[PDB]
From a paper:
We determined the CryoEM structure of mouse SIgA to a final average resolution of 3.3 Å. The refined structure revealed a pseudosymmetric assembly of two IgA monomers conjoined at the center by the JC and bound by SC. The FcAB and FcCD are bent and tilted with respect to each other, resulting in distinct concave and convex surfaces on the complex. To describe the conformation, we defined the angle between the centroid axes of FcAB and FcCD (97 degrees) as ‘bend’, and the angle between the two non-intersecting centroid planes of FcAB and FcCD (30 degrees) as ‘tilt’. SC asymmetrically contacts the same face of both FcAB and FcCD along what we define as the ‘front face’ of the molecule. The interface is dominated by the four heavy chain Tps (TpA, TpB, TpC, TpD) and the first half of the JC sequence, or, ‘core’ (JCcore), which together fold into a single β-sandwich-like domain at the center of the complex. The interface is further stabilized by the second half of the JC sequence, which folds into two beta-hairpin ‘wings’ (JCW1 and JCW2), each extending outward from the center of the complex and binding one CH3 from each IgA monomer. In contrast to unliganded SC, the SIgA structure reveals SC domains bound to dIgA in an elongated, open conformation contacting both antibodies and the JC asymmetrically on the front face of the complex. D1 contacts FcAB, FcCD and the JC, D2 protrudes away from other SC domains and the front face of the molecule, and D3 is clamped to D1, positioning D4 and D5 to contact FcCD and JCW1. The interface is dominated by residues in D5 CDR1, including Cys470, which disulfide bonds to CH2C Cys306, covalently linking SC to the antibody, as well as D5 CDR1 Lys471 and Tyr473, which form hydrogen bonding and hydrophobic interactions with CH2C.
Author numbering:
A (entry chain A), E (entry chain C), F (entry chain D): 237 to 467
B (entry chain J): 3 to 93, 97 to 137
C (entry chain E): 2 to 496, 509 to 548
D (entry chain B): 237 to 460
The structure:
């Protein structure tokens, strides 16, 4: 219940899919009532809409302070410093610093369903393996070729650090259930990954019944005018 | 060594040639031609639009390979006018079987956000499409 | 293929290494995936390090990968090496299944032995060393020799009694110091790879306890890598000591065997580089900065710089080697490389440079050639114009845009030659232009109406420049020439002449006025004319 | 801090090479020190050993206890009742029992590595997809073709409910980075899943270079 | 002879290689002395020059009047006219303007020498087939490795209308004799064509021996199962 | 109108088809309408025939007379010296015969179509490059394998003097449009050529699709797990 200030990193979905990098300077762990004041260094005119104090079941309060319109600061890596004052916790500072020392882009791998689920013809399980990315926070969604699927239709697990000798990376796996009818009926299902280190922030992968060399491939090649004139 | 005549990334094809002394006649010289084609197996009929089905046709014309659409300056002992090196370089984008690393191919994908839709673009080539 | 690096590296047991690998200048190759894989007997290049976050267990904590987009390269550091690390390696981008990569034959040695317990000397070739050989004070007033150990028998090579070896006559000498030292100091002013081996020094003719062996090894300087782009320039910096400053340097190219000379300080020059090569002045430190332009495939190879009284590669003198690799995927736009002008007309050459270093100094000289590789600046951002011109030459620094233009009117056969595009910038984009002159073929497209202009003070004067339809859609301009450049003059235009009126007239208005054109940003054919005022 | 009794079921590690299991009780939300007694009903030759009590971030204590030697009893669906008494809340009791009313065994599905990682020659991500089971608690252990890999070596995620309707069927995943060299040499990498619903409490799946080989692909070259 | 008016559009070499559009207005068919007047509608300050009169057969005079309206003016599509008043009769008038209705660009086809001449070492005949273009006038030039040869070595033929149906087009076949030795040394001999429809008004085709017809060809097809990048 | 004598050479068509001769002696630039007389060396059998006269644009007239001579006198080089006489004009006499001093046979060269048109599958072009012949006159025709093709389906550019040195070598070109469909079936299209310096008075060459196809058209397919691509 002791004082504890922490700068919450803005939500990735609130940073890539949108354009408001709402930073929060949470002052959690207060046995006493509220009555504090917040202050920021990069005062760009946007007043910090201060939020109320929530009293968790444990019996302590937690205040918050929002900062809108700080997307340019995050993209540029400008550090964010928050200062809060309170009788029980006078001096308290928090620092934000975008990770730009050992960041890596995620590697997406949309795997096809197994061999048994195909024989059942009931439901298929598609997996989107996102690998290699130092920033833990990552965004993952699915689409029915061009229609986005609701989050309640698929699952997204929590990132976990990848073991082994080397740099620090994370890994996630999202599962999507699909009907065999739409699978055989040539319906493209894609996996969209949103990340900061990526170029344009997004990367897409698609798959269908023709996952790629599925033991049945009818290839053709026609090299016409092979002996013609090559200007 | 061998001389290059065309190296088109759009529809990956490398057409090279060389002059080898005829083994049957040192006076005569044979003109050998080497061609290298890279037929993929995961690309689609359209590489910019992923809704198109897999491409298993792969038509390869030699007239489309050695095209050289890029212009070239010409000197006729007076003016340095510009000129084209092909008669089939028209401009709807043509079909490109394979990607070109230098170029950046993107696709539009709609997404939702707090009850609103947005047209975010995605990159197909992680290495490419970087602001630099 | 375009990837370049050390083709062969040799380290030692328990030692660190820092391998560097270049690649073309593109956003892809800078942000792509770097990798360092080992090639086995099965052909598959086993990956070991990559810029994505992979690190094999064998290299865990020993190596590290870094990507330098500014350098446009990527270095590979390694530590705690051993003998098992020997093998055929690679260095490229993306994946090993492609070709973008450069093979490496790293052969890590092991420390074999230190049999001679006192003094090892493993230095470079063509350098100077101080051979130390202590002994017993009782043996000072006696023998002071140094022999060469061999598998056959020992041979006296150096001695205080002038009993030396023919191969060391002049190339070495014994030096006896004072201060009560009791140690031998022998110099070897000239070293060669053959001089390596084992030697034995001893004092006293009788059996002394100072028969001390020596391990001499003459090495070659690590060839400095130079990853340059096609149709670009290069600066060979050959900085040696003051001992060879007063001597004649040179620059040769290693062929299949010996080194083919290309240029020296005696005026010699290869016809292949006639016009695209020179030698900078010699500073007090004897540093040379040979410059070359218009790089091509044939320029790739191993370059060597030395020094000798004859200015030719003679074995047994200082050496400074380089390894130049020309990247065919260059960013420099394909320039014409030749400009065919006509006498009396004019010429407009475009000298390029990096748009980021626009706030620098730019110059423009004429390649003399046969004398000694010169480049006398004729005009620059700060330099004025000489007296041989007094016009017919000026600069036009385009605000940014990458390049700047140079004008040269009143052309004549004496102006043909080679002209370079210098600038105080490390971009090293010095382009060489071959100016070809021809007799008066046809009439010029621009001709002023009043030739012998004789205006009057305080009286309106007018001059009109012809304006053919060939440049109907191009911009026009009148500018007064100065020793530093040409100042534009807001004149009057006509839909087919270019008029120029001076309502007032002052004696300062005299000089050389120019009539030119402009195609958006670049320039074209121009003409000059002198204007004088009467009284 | 309001005292509340929370009963914990033994973990899946009991059916392992281990011998016995362990039922656990806990009283969270206490401001008074220890001193109570964790009495049980099925105390048949089982010592109701107690454990140290910890605190919360605000002073709320947490008592605990254990019951060893109840593996066979719980396996037989035997019911257990916990009983404790402390001043701050009088007497608190609870009951538990092995849930087997709606049991469903998992369905392992080993997926092959993607063709993209093959070009890198680095590690290969092998996935072991589990699905269909009510008890979210599941055991996952990889094998290098009859060799037990360490837990830190491979990776395992947490169970999550399925995006369907009809019943609660959770699913889990696990990724293993295998060296491309060993993968090409031909070494089986099996995936062992543990669940009380399966016979013998264990199911195994294997996968390595076994798949419809693409040797039937037809290529038609025509040089007209 | 009976008098008549004829408006001669500017030439091509004087329009593409040169940008003056000296449009001419000739008054032919006169069997009497000169003494007429020429007037133009687009009076852009350039005074129209009334050239002298020549004498054709049977003593038929012929007057001409040019107007250097520059290429830009004639290019914009402006309609020019020529009102003339002659002494032998009343007056006459004509009209002329650029055409861009059924205008098509030429389809250059640089054919290689025939095998009948390659067997020897004499000259080799290079043909530059120009096809499909409505504007009759066409320019044809050659280059021997960035060096224009004098027109006294080419063999350009007058355009002739195609025999097919539909649109109206013309064809020409310029020929150039090249030494077999130079053909073996690896020297280029390109063919340039100038036309109005052509964007940039110039097209080029260049052919050394290797672009021609080879003998022993070696094709190498590859089946890449990874990414679709050509490198 | 200035009266002037003129002798017309018989067209090579009749000479290379089964006709003795047919020289025409004309007197152009004639003034006043009135008959004339024409005499010449007596040929074998036929005498003289006076053809009808016509006028010109400005009023000039022309009287013509034909002489069905002999082919033997042509091959031997004999001359049919003409002589015209009529009031208002003097007695003009001319002479013409066969150029039997420097005659060269036409070196026909049949070229294949380009690789471009061969791929569009619309209409191909075939050129009959003829060269090496002092008399610019020549008869050109095409065949559909064996049937006589019509001149309304192809073109015949006018001959032109080559830029050679020494003899007056000429050159002609004839473009023929062919459908790619016939090409796909393996048809033939020859080029008939008729000249004076040609035994049998004819010479042709065909265009069966092979026309010396390249030898050893190799090919290889690579579908290994390891691409091993080069650069
Ligand atoms: C582009 O490539 C070049 C070539 O690799 C890079 O140059 C070196 O880069 C490394 C890694 O970034 C730097 O390492 C740092 O060095 C800091 C101090 O710099 C010393 O580096 C050398 C380390 O051994 C040292 O020998 C060197 O001494 C030289 O300069 C002295 C004057 O500065 C001079 O008195 C000496 O006689 C000698 O000539 C430098 O003092 C160090 O503090 C860091 O901890 C780190 O080790 C090197 O410094 C760079 N310079 C070198 C090796 O000379 C370059 O950095 C690349 N581009 C960019 C943007 O980094
Ligand atoms: C290694 O040491 C030798 C010995 O000093 C260096 O060469 C020596 O250079 C000196 C230059 O001062 C020479 O002596 C001078 O010669 C000039 C004539 O040019 C004379 O006028 C001066 O009075 C003075 O005597 C000396 O002869 C010469 N010796 C030899 C053997 O070449 C050499 O440069 C050194 N090398 C390195 C890499 O340091
Ligand atoms: C392949 O797909 C691409 C991307 O959709 C197509 O390019 C787009 O075409 C649509 C419809 O014509 C336009 O609205 C877009 O502006 C285009 N996007 C671009 C050019 O980036 C392309 O047309 C498709 N290929 C073919 C042959 O149709
Ligand atoms: C042997 O070699 C050493 C090293 O080169 C010489 O030392 C030089 O001495 C001169 C005169 O004192 C100095 O000017 C130089 O600067 C010294 N060398 C260096 C590298 O600084 C020495 O003179 C040579 N001869 C003897 C007899 O020792
Ligand atoms: C990626 O997200 C950042 C977050 O602020 C945004 O600035 C940037 O514009 C996004 N990328 C693109 C291509 O818009
Ligand atoms: C080609 O010339 C015509 C006639 O002057 C002009 O209309 C056209 O714009 C020119 N093409 C260019 C400038 O690309
Ligand atoms: C080249 O072609 C000739 C023609 O038949 C053949 O005999 C020879 O073997 C071929 N050589 C190669 C290397 O293809
Ligand atoms: C090339 O073709 C000739 C034709 O006779 C044949 O004899 C020879 O074996 C062929 N060589 C190859 C390598 O195909």
């Amino acid at each position: 219940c002791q004082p504890s200030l922490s700068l919450q990193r803005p939500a990735l979905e609130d940073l890539l899919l949108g354009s408001d990098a709402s930073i929060t300077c949470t002052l959690n762990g207060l046995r006493n009532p509220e009555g504090a004041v917040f202050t920021w260094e990069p005062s760009t005119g946007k007043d910090a809409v201060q939020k109320k104090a929530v009293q968790n079941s444990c019996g302590c309060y937690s205040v918050s302070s929002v900062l809108p319109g700080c997307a340019e600061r995050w993209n540029s890596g400008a550090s964010f410093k928050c200062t809060v004052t309170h009788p029980e916790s006078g001096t308290l500072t928090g620092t934000i610093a975008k990770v730009t020392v050992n960041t890596f882009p995620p590697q997406v791998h949309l795997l096809p369903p197994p061999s048994e689920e195909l024989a059942l013809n009931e439901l298929l399980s598609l997996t989107c393996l996102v690998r290699a990315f130092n920033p833990k926070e990552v965004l993952v969604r699915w689409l029915h070729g061009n229609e986005e699927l609701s989050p309640e239709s698929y699952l997204v697990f929590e990132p976990l650090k990848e073991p082994g000798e080397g740099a620090t990376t994370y890994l996630v796996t999202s599962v999507l259930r699909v009907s065999a009818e739409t699978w055989k009926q040539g319906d493209q299902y894609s996996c969209m990954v949103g990340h900061e280190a990526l170029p344009m922030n997004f990367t897409q992968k698609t798959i269908d019944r023709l996952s790629g060399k599925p033991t049945n491939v009818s290839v053709s090649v026609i090299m016409s005018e092979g002996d013609g004139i090559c200007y | 060594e061998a001389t290059i005549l065309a190296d088109n990334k759009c529809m990956c094809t490398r057409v090279t040639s060389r002059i080898i002394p005829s083994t049957e006649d040192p006076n005569e010289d044979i003109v050998e031609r080497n061609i290298r084609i890279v037929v993929p197996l995961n690309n689609r009929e359209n590489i910019s639009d992923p809704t198109s089905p897999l491409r298993r046709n792969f038509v390869y014309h030699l007239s489309d390979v050695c095209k050289k659409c890029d212009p070239v300056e010409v000197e006729l002992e007076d003016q340095v006018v510009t000129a084209t090196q092909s008669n089939i370089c028209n401009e709807v984008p043509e079909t490109c079987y394979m990607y070109d690393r230098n170029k950046c191919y993107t696709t539009m994908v709609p997404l939702r956000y707090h009850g609103e839709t947005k047209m975010v673009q995605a990159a197909l080539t992680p290495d490419s499409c970087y602001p630099d | 293929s375009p990837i370049f690096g050390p083709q062969e590296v040799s380290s030692i047991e328990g030692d660190s290494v820092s391998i560097t690998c270049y690649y073309p200048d593109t956003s892809v190759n800078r942000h792509t995936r770097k990798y360092w894989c080992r090639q086995g007997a099965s052909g598959m290049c086993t990956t070991l390090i990559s810029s994505n976050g992979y690190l094999s267990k064998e290299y865990s904590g020993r190596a590290n990968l870094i990507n330098f987009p500014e350098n446009n390269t990527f270095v590979i550091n390694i530590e705690q090496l051993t003998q098992d690390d020997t093998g055929s390696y690679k260095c490229g981008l993306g994946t090993s299944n492609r070709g973008l990569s450069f093979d490496v034959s790293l052969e890590v040695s092991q420390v074999p032995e230190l049999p001679s317990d006192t003094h090892v000397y493993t230095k470079d070739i063509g350098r100077n060393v101080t051979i130390e050989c202590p002994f017993k004070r009782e043996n000072a007033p006696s023998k002071k020799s140094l022999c060469k150990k061999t598998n056959q028998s020992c041979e006296l090579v150096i001695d205080s009694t002038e009993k030396v070896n023919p191969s060391y006559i002049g190339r070495a000498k014994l030096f006896m110091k004072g201060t009560d030292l009791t140690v031998f100091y022998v110099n070897i002013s000239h070293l060669t790879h053959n001089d390596a081996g084992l030697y034995i020094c001893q004092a006293g003719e009788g059996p002394s306890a100072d028969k001390k062996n020596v391990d001499l090894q003459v090495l070659a300087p690590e060839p400095e890598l130079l990853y340059k782009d096609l149709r670009s320039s290069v600066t060979f910096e050959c900085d040696l000591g003051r001992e060879v400053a007063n001597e004649a340097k040179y620059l040769c190219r290693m062929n299949k065997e010996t080194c083919d000379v290309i240029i020296n300080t005696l005026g010699k020059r290869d016809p292949d580089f006639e016009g695209r090569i020179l030698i900078t002045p010699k500073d007090d430190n004897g540093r040379f900065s040979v410059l070359i332009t218009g790089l091509r495939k044939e320029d790739a190879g191993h370059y060597q710089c030395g020094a000798h009284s004859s200015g030719l590669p003679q074995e047994g003198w200082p050496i400074q080697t380089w390894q130049l690799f020309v990247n065919e995927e260059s960013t420099i736009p394909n320039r014409r490389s030749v400009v065919k002008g006509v006498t009396g007309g004019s010429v407009a050459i475009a000298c390029p440079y990096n748009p980021k270093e626009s706030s620098s100094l730019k110059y423009w000289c004429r390649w003399e050639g046969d004398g000694n590789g010169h480049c006398p600046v004729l005009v620059g951002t700060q330099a004025q114009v000489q007296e041989e011109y007094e016009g017919r030459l000026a600069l036009f620094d385009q605000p940014g845009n990458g390049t700047y233009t140079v004008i040269l009117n009143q052309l004549t056969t004496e102006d043909a030659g080679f002209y370079w595009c210098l600038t105080n910038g490390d971009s090293r984009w010095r382009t060489t232009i071959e100016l070809q002159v021809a007799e008066a073929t046809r009439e010029p497209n621009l001709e002023v109406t009043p030739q012998n202009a004789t205006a009057v003070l305080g009286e309106t004067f007018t001059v009109s420049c012809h304006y053919p339809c060939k440049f109907y859609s191009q911009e026009k301009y009148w500018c007064k020439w100065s020793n530093k450049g040409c100042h534009i003059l807001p004149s009057h235009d006509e839909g087919q002449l270019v008029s120029m009126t001076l309502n007032p007239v002052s004696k300062e208005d005299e000089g050389w006025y120019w009539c030119g054109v402009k195609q958006g940003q670049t320039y074209g054919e121009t003409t000059a004319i002198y204007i004088a005022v009467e009284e």
